[PDB]
DNA sequence: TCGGACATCGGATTGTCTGA
C-alpha cells in the first residue's frame, strides 16, 4: 500500500529459486554506498483470477529489501527462512539501512532492478 | 486532492481512469 521494495521484482519463470554467489545480488543504486549494499530478496507468489474466470498461481516474484527494512526488517542477516535469500556486496556493513528504508508508491515509482554487469542468475530468471 | 475500481500479470509492490 504505502511500503514497498525500492525495486521491481525478479520474476522466477523456472523451477529454480533465486540465489546468488556470495558477493552478488544487490541492485545498482546510486543512492547506496558499498556499506549499504546488503539485504534480502523475499518471494511473493500470487494466486489470481484470470479472464476466463479460472484461478492460477502466477510466477513467483522476488523483491529486494535492504537489511533491516521491509517485511523481514527484524530478521538478522543470514537467518534461515523459507522464501528469504540473503545478498551482500563484499564488505557491506551489518547494520539496518534505516536511511534508505522502503518506498512509498504514492511518492516514488520503483527503480527497475539492475544487477551489476556479469552477475550470475539461475536459469529461468531473465537477464 | 484522493480513494477506489479494474485490468489479465507487462508493472497489480502498477497503470489507468475518474467518482466523489
Numbering used by the authors: 47 to 173
Give the published text.
SARS-CoV-2 nucleocapsid (N) protein is a structural component of the virus with essential roles in the replication and packaging of the viral RNA genome. The N-NTD of SARS-CoV-2 plays a critical role in LLPS and viral RNP assembly. Here, we show that a compact stem-loop DNA aptamer binds tightly to SARS-CoV-2 N-NTD.
The A58-20 aptamer binds to a highly positively charged concave surface of N-NTD, which was shown by earlier NMR studies to be involved in RNA-binding. Consistent with the biochemical observations above, N-NTD engages the hexanucleotide loop of the aptamer, whereas the flanking sequences form a double-stranded stem pointed away from the protein. The thymine base at the 6th position (T6) is flipped out of the loop and π-stacked against Tyr109, where it is stabilized by hydrogen bonding to the main chain nitrogen atom of Ser51 and the side chains of Arg88 and Tyr111, explaining the critical role of this base and the loss of affinity for the T6-to-A variant. Tyr109 is also hydrogen-bonded to the backbone phosphate and thus appears to be a key residue in the interface.
